[PDB]
Amino acid sequence: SLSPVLLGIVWTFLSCGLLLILFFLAFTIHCRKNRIVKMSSPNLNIVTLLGSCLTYSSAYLFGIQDVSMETLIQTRLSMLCIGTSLVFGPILGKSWRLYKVFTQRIKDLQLLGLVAALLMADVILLMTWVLTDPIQCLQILSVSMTVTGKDVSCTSTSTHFCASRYSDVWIALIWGCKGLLLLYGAYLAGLTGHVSSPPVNQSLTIMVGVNLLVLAAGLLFVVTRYLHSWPNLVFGLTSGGIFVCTTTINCFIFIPQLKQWKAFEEENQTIRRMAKYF
Amino acid sequence: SLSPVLLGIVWTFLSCGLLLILFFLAFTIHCRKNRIVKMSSPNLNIVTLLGSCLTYSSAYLFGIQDVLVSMETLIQTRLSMLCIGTSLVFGPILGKSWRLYKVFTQRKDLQLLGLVAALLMADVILLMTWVLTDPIQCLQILSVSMTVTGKDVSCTSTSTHFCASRYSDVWIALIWGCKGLLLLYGAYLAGLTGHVSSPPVNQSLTIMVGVNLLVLAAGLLFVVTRYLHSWPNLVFGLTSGGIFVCTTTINCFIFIPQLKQWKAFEEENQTIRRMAKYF
Ligand SMILES: CCCCCC/C=C/CCCCCCCC(=O)OC[C@H](COP(=O)([O-])OCC[N+](C)(C)C)OC(=O)CCCCCCCCCCCCCCCCC
Ligand SMILES: CCCCCC/C=C/CCCCCCCC(=O)OC[C@H](COP(=O)([O-])OCC[N+](C)(C)C)OC(=O)CCCCCCCCCCCCCCCCC
C-alpha cells in the first residue's frame, strides 16, 4: 500500500544519514588522541552514534507493512526509545561534567553509569509494557447509534489497528520520563551557558535537540493517531522527523569538531612549511 | 453524584489556598515600596497571583457534576481557565528570570508585560480555535463490537455517555506542546541564572520545581481522566489535589523567601531603632 517512489526516497535519505553517522564514527575512532577530538569526550560520542544508528534502523523498520506484526511494532518502537535515550544520555553527561569542573571540581565510568541507569529506566518501562499488555492487532467491526440529545445518527465502521488496551498510559509514561530528562537537560544547557567553545560546550545542541524532539513527537503522535488512513503520509512524516532530528543533533555535535580539527592541522601544516623553508 | 465529604474537604483546601493567595496579594500591594519587595517584581507578582486565583477557581468548577444538565460550556470554561491561569502563573517568572539574566549580561516591566501578553495571546488563539472549530459535545453512544483476533472472536455491548471533542488529542498535543516548549525555555533560563543572586531575586529553584511538578501532574491527570471515568470521586479529588499542590508550591516558593527577608529586615530596623533610643 506504500508507493515504491516514497520508499526509495526515504531509504536513500536514511542510508545517507547512516553513512554520515559511520563517517563521524570513523573520524572519532581514528582521531581519538587529537587534542580537539580528545577534549570533546570521544568515548561518550560512540554511544551517541550508536543510538543514532538504532534510530535510523527503527526509521527503516517503520516502512514495512504486511509482515508477526505485533513483534515488528514493539521492536521498532523499543528500538526508537532505546536509540533516543542513547543519543541524549551522553550529551547530558558531557554538560554535567563541564558544569562540575567549572564549579569547584569525573571519570567516563561514572557518566556511563548514569547513562546506564537512564537506559535501565527505559528498559524497565518497555519490559513492563510488553509483558503487562502487548500490542495485539484486532479487527473491530461495530454498529454505533449516536444520541446527542437533539439528533440521532447511526454509523457502521469496520476498522483494524495495532495497539494496546491501555496505550495512552504507556504513552504518558514514556513521554513523561523523557520530558523530565529533557527538562533537566535544558537546565544543564543553561548552567553551562557560554562557558566554553561549541565543541566542548554542548548547550545549543541540547536546546535544538529537545525542541525538535518535542515538536516531532507531538506531530507524529497526532498524525499516527488520526491520519491512519494515509499510510504514505504517516510513513514519510515519521521517517522525515526521525531523520531530521537525528541528523541535526549529530551535525551540531560533530561539525564544530571537524572544522576545528581542519584549522588545527592547517596551522600545523603552516608551521611545518615554515620549518622546511628555513 | 459526588460524595459530600470529598466535596467539603476539597472546597476547604481550595479555600485555604485562595486565602493564602489573597494574603500574598495584600502583602505585595501593601509593601510595594519596601526594599525587599521592590528588588523583586511586585507588578509581575500580581500577575502570578491572579493566575493562581484563576487556577484555584477552575478546581472548584471541576467538582460541579450532574447539575447543569450547559455541561459543554462548563467543561470548556473550566479548561480555558486552567490554560490561562497556567500562562499567567508561569509567564511572569520567566520574565523575571530573563530580566535578571539580561541585567548581569550586558554589552522594564512594560516589555515583560508585553512578552507575557504575547504568551497569553498564543493560548487565546489556541483556545478560540479549539472552541470554534471542534467544540466539546456531550454525546451518548450505544454500540456493539465484534472483536475478532487472529483466532478468537468475542462480542461486547457498550453504552457510554462522555463529553469530549471529536479531535481532542489534536488540541491536547497542541496545548501540551506549546506549554512544554515554553517550559523548556524556562528551564534554560533557570539554568542561565543558576547562581546569579538570592532566591528572592533568583527564580531557578521555583522554575525547576514548578516545571517538574507541572509535567508530572498533567501526565497523571490526563491518564486518570481518560481511563478512570468510572471513578468520579477519584478523578475529581486527584485533579483538585494536583491543581492545589502545583499552585500552592509555586506561590510558596515565590513568596515565602520575600516574607523571611522582609521580617529579617524589619527586625534589624527595630534593633537599630532601639540602639538609637539607648544613645
Ligand atoms: C533523536 C531521534 C528520536 C526522535 C524521534 C521522534 C519520533 C517519534 C515517532 C514515534 C512516536 C509516535 C508513534 C506512537 C506509537 C504508535 O505508533 O502506535 C502504536 C501504539 C499506540 O497506538 P495509537 O494510540 O497511536 O493509535 C491507536 C488509536 N486508538 C484509538 C486505538 C487508541 O503504541 C503504544 O501502545 C504505546 C507505545 C509506547 C512506546 C514508546 C514509543 C516510541 C518513543 C520514541 C520517542 C521517545 C523520545 C521523545 C519523547 C518526547 C519528548 C519528551
Ligand atoms: C500551575 C497550576 C496549573 C497546573 C495544573 C495541572 C493540571 C492539569 C489537569 C487538567 C488536564 C487534564 C484534563 C484533560 C481534558 C479533559 O478533562 O477531558 C475533556 C477533553 C478530552 O477528554 P478525554 O480524551 O480525556 O476523555 C474522553 C476519551 N475519548 C476516548 C472519548 C477521547 O478535553 C479536550 O478535548 C482537550 C481540551 C484541551 C484544553 C486544555 C486543557 C487544560 C490545560 C491545563 C494544563 C496546561 C498546563 C500544563 C501543560 C503540560 C506541561 C507542558
From Swiss-Prot, chain B:
Q: Which residues lie on this side of the membrane: Cytoplasmic?
A: 26-43, 95-111, 191-204
Localisation per UniProt entry:
Cell membrane
What are the GO MF terms of this UniProt record? G protein-coupled GABA receptor activity
Query: Listed GO cellular component terms?
Result: G protein-coupled receptor heterodimeric complex; plasma membrane
Where is this protein chiefly located?
membrane
Q: Which UniProt keywords apply?
A: Cell membrane, Coiled coil, Deafness, G-protein coupled receptor, Glycoprotein, Membrane, Non-syndromic deafness, Receptor, Transducer, Transmembrane, Transmembrane helix
Q: Please give the tissue specificity annotation from the record for this chain.
A: Ubiquitous expression both in the CNS and in peripheral tissues. Very high expression in fetal brain and testis relative to expression in other tissues.
Question: Extracellular face: residue ranges?
Answer: 65-73, 133-169, 226-235
Superkingdom, natural source: Eukaryota
**BP-aspect Gene Ontology terms:** gamma-aminobutyric acid signaling pathway; stereocilium bundle organization
**Similarity field:** Belongs to the G-protein coupled receptor 3 family. GABA-B receptor subfamily.
The protein's job, in short, is:
Orphan G-protein coupled receptor involved in the regulation of hair cell orientation in mechanosensory organs of the inner ear. It is required to trigger a 180 degree reversal in hair cell orientation, creating a virtual line of polarity reversal (LPR) across which stereociliary bundles are arranged in opposite orientations.
User: Can you name this protein?
Assistant: Probable G-protein coupled receptor 156
Source organism (scientific name): Homo sapiens (Human)
